Structure formats: C-alpha cells, structure tokens
C-alpha cells in the first residue's frame, strides 16, 4: 500500500503522453544535411475528460 | 512575434500526437505527488506538465 | 470530423447509484512545446551533495 | 399566481445558459503550476429562435 | 454541419388556428466573455443600509 496513501496497483492507469508535432520553418533552397534548428513557434489547447467509476 | 507585438492565429493543418503506454514500458512518473494535476475547480485552465525521468 | 464540428461535449457530473458512483470531470488544457522539440540530458549540478545527485 | 402577473409554474421553462469556452494565449515554454491569467480575447454571436404554442 | 453550411433558418411568424396559436420569433444575439472567464464573490458595499445587504 503506497506510503503516501491510496491504492497500490501493479498495472495502474497508464500514462497519457502528448506532444505538439514539429512544423519546420522555411528550409533553405539548397540542400543541407544538418538538423533543423528552426520551427514554427506554436502551442495547442483543447479539453480533457476523465470518468472514473 | 514581430517587434513589440504578438499575433496568434489558427494553424489548421498542424497535428498533436498522443499515446498511452499500456505495456508500462516507460519510467512511471505518476504517483510521485507532482503538481500539474487537473485543477480542483472545473472552471480553471491548467498547463500540461513536461515529462522527464 | 471537421474544422467546424465539435469533437465532444463537456461532461462534468456525478451520479450516485447506491452501490457504485461515477465521477466525470472535464477541463481545458494548454500544451507548450517543451525543450524546443528536442530531448536533453539532465544531471545534478557540480558540487551538489552526494545525497542530491 | 405571480404578483407581477402571469402564470405560476412549478416547473417553468428551464434556464438556458451559454458561455464562450476559454482559449489560452501562448503559454510559457517552461512549466508553471499557476492558473492561466491570459486568454485570447473573443466573443460570439448567432441567432436564437423560440416557438411557443 | 460545416463551416459553409447554415445551421438553421429564420423563423419569425404567427399562425392562428382558431383554438391554438403559435408564435415563433428569431433574433440575433451577441455574447461577451463575462468576468474574464472566472467566477467572483459579490456582496453589498460596506455601510449599505441593513435592508440592502
């Protein structure tokens, strides 16, 4: 039993992981094998709903 | 951000990517009593925490 | 599915059936881009005490 | 019977309640557990239709 | 459903059937964001008279 309190679970509710997909900004007209350091600045938002029985 | 002003616009084609690990293959951060929970009061808006291990 | 169609409704509510209870909650979230899209190594700083590494 | 006049009802026409959902504005790149004080300024409009028999 | 499809038409009209009557009315509304998205406690001011608290 967790020492902070609550229900010890071998298989707890899984972790939900979320990311904003990268959106490159204006590549150069000539090829470069280097990594992209420049992206469109941006974020996201929305609603999340949890129902426990 | 141009000069001292900031514009925010929809990017309709951008994606957000989401998975849940049901096989428990990542370090499990939950249950460490971290902050960034869904707020107590339903009218609050919260920032999504960053994942690290 | 669409730009002008809602993906879901706001469910925040609680029902007591006398044996079970269901607690539903909905929130609004905001998701920055952390670490400017890239993973990073992190470690304790220099002369931090042995307990804190 | 209401003293202002009209029809007293135990179960009147219900209240229709309407809200603009919040849209956060540009969260910081590093996590903060504080409440959002900054939103996209905005309003809505539309048409409403009532038919009584 | 869509960005370019009307969700409904304008019904404002009255029909007299000799026993019933149906009065339909349509209007256009505007909906600000009140209290900058958040609930607030309100109360009478200070030395307001006892009747007005």
Half-sphere exposure for B40 (CA within 13 Å, toward CB): 1
What is the least distance, in Å, from the CA of D32 to any CA of chain C? Answer: 11
Tell me how close the Cα of B22 comes to any Cα of chain D, in angstroms. Answer: 26
For C35-44, b/e burial (b = at least 16 CB within 10 A) is: eeeeeeeeee
Chains A and E touch (3+ CB pairs under 8 A): no
Nearest-CA neighbor of A23 among D19, C25, C36, D41? C36
Q: Under a CB-based contact definition with an 8 Å cutoff, are residues B45 and D40 in contact? A: no
Which of D21, D27, D30 lies nearest to residue C30, judging by beta carbons?
D27
Residue B46: CB atoms within 10 A of its CB come to 21
- Cα(B36)–Cα(D32) distance, integer angstroms: 8
Task: Name the method of structure determination.
Answer: cryo-EM
What six digits make up the tokens of D51?
């038919």
Chains near B (3 or more Cβ pairs under 8 Å)? A, C, D, E
Query: Are D47 and E26 a contacting pair at CB < 8 A?
Result: yes
């Amino acid at each position: 039993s967790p020492l902070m309190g609550g229900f010890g679970l071998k298989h707890p509710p899984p972790q939900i992981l979320i990311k904003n997909t990268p959106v490159p900004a204006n590549p150069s007209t000539t090829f470069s094998a280097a990594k992209f350091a420049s992206f469109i600045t941006q974020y996201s938002t929305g609603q999340v709903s949890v129902e426990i029985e | 951000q141009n000069d001292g002003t900031t514009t925010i616009a929809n990017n309709l084609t951008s994606t957000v990517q989401v998975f849940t690990d049901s096989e428990y293959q990542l370090p499990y951060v939950l249950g460490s009593a971290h902050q960034g929970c869904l707020p107590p009061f339903p009218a609050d808006v919260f920032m999504v925490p960053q994942y690290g291990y | 599915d669409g730009v002008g169609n809602s993906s879901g409704n706001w469910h925040c509510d609680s029902t007591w059936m006398g044996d079970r209870v269901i607690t539903t909650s909905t929130r609004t979230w905001a998701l920055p881009t952390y670490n400017n899209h890239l993973y990073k190594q992190i470690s304790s700083q220099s002369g931090a005490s042995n307990d804190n590494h």
